[PDB]
Amino acid sequence: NIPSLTSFAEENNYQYGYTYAQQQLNKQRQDFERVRLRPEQLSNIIHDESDTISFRSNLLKNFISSNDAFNMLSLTTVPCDRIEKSRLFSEKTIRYLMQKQHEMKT
Amino acid sequence: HSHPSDMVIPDHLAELIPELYSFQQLVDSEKRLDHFIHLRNLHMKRMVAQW
């Protein structure tokens, strides 16, 4: 097949109305461009991450994540002088930067 | 669930924490290192097959 560019012309094709070579080329045209342009009627209809995203699950997760983070704010009756600060380094990041600074003189 | 989306620290954190650029161009510095290993492997598949 792989019919033509002349078979795609408007003269050899039907229009809103109101030969043999044309009716032979339009067989191969409609037999080529209906196995090429047909959509996939099976799975892999996900196509990406941002099509199977769920508004209901994210809305439920945000309803939980706002409620518990607001219960963290108001109901935690620890005064501001008593809120102890967290460490800016870990127990492993403080070992690796003692190791690499020891090995930095090479 | 390999999400390609969440490998990016796009703007809002990197403007606040400037070390994230030092993180991100770290990762890119890894990504051209492993590729240098990859062109190495296709090198070592070649020369043995050459010999």
Binding site: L88, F89, L97, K100, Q101, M104 | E19, S22
Partner: peptide
């Protein structure tokens, strides 16, 4: 500068050490 978080002189030198080791 972020001296509100990095208030101690220790943690500022630790952050500078981190940037130094990254660049090296």
């Amino acid at each position: 500068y972020r001296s509100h978080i990095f208030a101690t002189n220790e943690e500022r030198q630790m952050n500078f050490l981190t940037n130094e080791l990254i660049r090296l």
